[PDB]
Amino acid sequence: GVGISTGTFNNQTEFKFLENGWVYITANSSRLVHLNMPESENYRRVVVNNLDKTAVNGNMALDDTHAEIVTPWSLVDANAWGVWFNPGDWQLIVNTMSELHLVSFEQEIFNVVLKTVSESATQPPTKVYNNDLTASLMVALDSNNTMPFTPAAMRSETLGFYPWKPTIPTPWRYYFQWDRTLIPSHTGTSGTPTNIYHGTDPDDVQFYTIENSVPVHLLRTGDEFATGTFFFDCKPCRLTHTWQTNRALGLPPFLNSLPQSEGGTNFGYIGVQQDKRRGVTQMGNTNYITEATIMRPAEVGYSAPYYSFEASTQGPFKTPIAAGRGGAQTDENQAADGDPRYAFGRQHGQKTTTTGETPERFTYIAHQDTGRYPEGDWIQNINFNLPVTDDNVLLPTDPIGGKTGINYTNIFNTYGPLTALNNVPPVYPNGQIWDKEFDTDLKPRLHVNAPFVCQNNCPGQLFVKVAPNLTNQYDPDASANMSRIVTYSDFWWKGKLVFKAKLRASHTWNPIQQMSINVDNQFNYVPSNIGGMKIVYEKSQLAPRKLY
Amino acid sequence: TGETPERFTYIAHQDTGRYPEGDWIQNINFNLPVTDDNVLLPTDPIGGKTGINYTNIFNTYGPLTALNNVPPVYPNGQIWDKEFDTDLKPRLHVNAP
Amino acid sequence: SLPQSEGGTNFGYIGVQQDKRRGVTQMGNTNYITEATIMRPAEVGYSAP
């Protein structure tokens, strides 16, 4: 019926404490989604080109050239932390939980409303909105994951984080195949390097369509759609950070002489000369046993080529790295490769009363200390004569290939059988929750964007489209675009995301770091006088844990 | 006639490979456009050898690496191979799927 | 901005300037979000000597 509501708005986070210290967390999110009709009812194949930018020698890092199928449909993506948890709930979770499991996910659409804009021809323009009770909203649910997976948080296009603000969906578009060549150059590179877009190789063409691969439900003003509960199987996400590096693994050396009076200069002394110490070292030609040369069980962290660009059929891409930098915690402005930087708009955290289109930005300096500090590690000759000379060492200050600004660490990879690393920490509120595992026979060990990875499947993507509202002059034989009555839709989206977490237990004398309100961040969690809201980034691994 | 074997190179249809002339390295500062001192192009020599560039000694295999199994080759391709006796075993074999 | 007429030179344009775009990148010291610097889930393929 038109006058009977088909659902209830619900945005309450529930905690239900189970046996053995586990907590059943239910995050109900509810939004009002506004949807305009598509620009055109037809699928487009658009080749986006920015050769003007890359035509300038040395700008190869600014390539946006690609090919995309632009579709008339719109994607309703809720794969972002902010959509589910308000700052207080996240504070509770990070301060008192230790591990997080993704349990279930369900979503539904109700109170579908379709309206048409009749723009009067009156000399002073005016427009009246009318309820078209017969219009239909097409809802498609890719339950079988037939369509390409296109997470929205990567582009900051998920639903809004404010329950009391209407949100808009994102027009769905998926990459089409293409070939590209961008020979790197630098300021001073003579001529124009080879920069060509070869087009689409026929063997790799895929042209998906929702109308052909997904059943489509037509919802009038009195209808509702529910996706049913989806159950995850993702690995647990740890809410604790590791501080121990190789230098802090195992039994420390025995201090034969200990300080006698408190002070900043009263250090402990091992006493025994370095060459006469007792231990085990992987270096078989030196008797010097040191805190640096001692044998650790394995390697915590791996050095990777940083700011290295790799070319493939589609052009250049930046090599990802799964660890943060060392010493970047001192200042966010001193961040470097590996620290994820998020840019977001007024829907996703930026002060809602800000003027201008400049996105709000922040670099997330993770609390885990498993990264690398390239200025430190060096290489020296096998003879290990000490002190080393210029001919027997390769310091980070040394050039490679004659380039004064590029040193050896830029092309150094220490990933090996002994490498150990942690999963990506959650980022609030702009961070993604789950991601799909790759279809490759051999699959990546971890993803750099989401902490939870679907082993089998992720929930089907939800697509919404205002059904065509034809005028009486329609003619399919006309090459011109279809004439449509201006129409839009407002519908309420309600989702339930269920987590399971473990409550932390104190295991040390000293307290641990905790998220708290303070005089500096006070006014970042309350509205301004003109209704301005914001959601600042919050750290998710404040509690430490021992690695070995 | 003759003992010259018949030869062919199997260019697999999968597009998960790399194009060494493309990918490059640049300084962390990421000042743009990059200058000579802040980039290491594939045209740059390593150790003074004009024909050997940095991609020859570059390994990007890491925890995020993903790859596909070897495609079958007909008719001369092998079908099955034995897994190694090593305690830690290779992820895939380059000769049999 | 999408093309209006079919042709080999009618490409689509993103419109927004590179430095003012919205997204996530693993590079924490650049505001330039590009089709190359954007963060992908993982790495398909590996360069080897």
């Epitope: 080109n49 890359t54 300038v56 003579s190 001529g191 920069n195 087009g199 | - | 030179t9």
Partner: antibody, heavy 130, light 107 residues
């Protein structure tokens, strides 16, 4: 249709300064590299300067190098002229430099390039004398 | 400066050719563009490489490039073709280089 309109041409004294403008409409002005090209009375075309699509780099000819400057504001082009000399008297035009060239008739594949100007403005006359 | 012929002349309906020349190190690797210049008008792009014409340009124009030389062919002269023709390109010294022009004329 693409529209480029120049303005600012006027009589000026030698050794002074001036500002010429090139307003653009009907196309994505920010997606195209731009160029200032001058022609003296009855003489051939002479390249004055050029600027990229983001202002990262600008290039000049030796005659105006160190004297003039070029800038853009996403809506129009500007040429700042300093140290004007008698020979500078000429008509100036703003043209889009074709940054892409398709290599097939339907032009499914395209390549980067330089040295071809696609669209031109109307042009403006600058006279420097007493 | 690229080399060009000062002028040419021909009868109506004749298919004619004009040439621009320069060092292959600059005219070779870079593209070449041909523009028309009528009295009381700014240069109009007639040929933009790959034998492709801008919209609104008569199909009579054609162009080709070979090493040091670039050739522009007109398939049948018309009274409105009496005008200056200008070749331009990019130069590996990071310049934009034009020719001296050629005043096409009709007998």
């Amino acid at each position: 249709e693409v529209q480029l309109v120049e303005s600012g041409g006027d009589l000026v004294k030698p050794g002074g300064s001036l500002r010429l403008s090139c307003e653009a409409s009907g196309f994505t002005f920010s997606n195209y590299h731009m160029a200032w090209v001058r022609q003296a009375p009855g003489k051939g075309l002479q390249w004055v300067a050029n600027i990229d699509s983001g202002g990262f780099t600008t290039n000049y000819v030796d005659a105006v190098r160190g004297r003039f400057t070029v800038s853009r504001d996403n809506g129009a082009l500007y040429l700042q002229m300093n140290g004007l000399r008698v020979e500078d008297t000429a008509v100036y035009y703003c043209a889009t430099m074709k940054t892409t060239y398709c290599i097939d008739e339907n032009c499914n594949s395209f390549q980067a390039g330089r040295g071809v100007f696609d669209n031109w403005g109307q042009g403006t006359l600058v006279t420097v004398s007493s | 400066v690229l080399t060009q012929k000062a002028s040419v002349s021909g009868s109506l309906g004749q298919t004619i050719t004009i040439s621009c020349t320069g060092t292959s190190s600059n005219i070779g690797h870079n593209n070449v563009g041909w523009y028309q210049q009528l009295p009381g008008r700014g240069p109009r792009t007639v040929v933009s490489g790959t034998n492709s014409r801008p919209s609104g340009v008569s199909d009579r124009f054609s162009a080709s490039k070979s090493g040091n030389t670039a050739t522009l062919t007109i398939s049948g002269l018309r009274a409105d073709d009496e005008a200056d023709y200008y070749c331009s390109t990019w130069d590996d010294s990071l310049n934009v280089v034009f020719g001296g022009g050629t005043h096409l004329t009709v007998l």
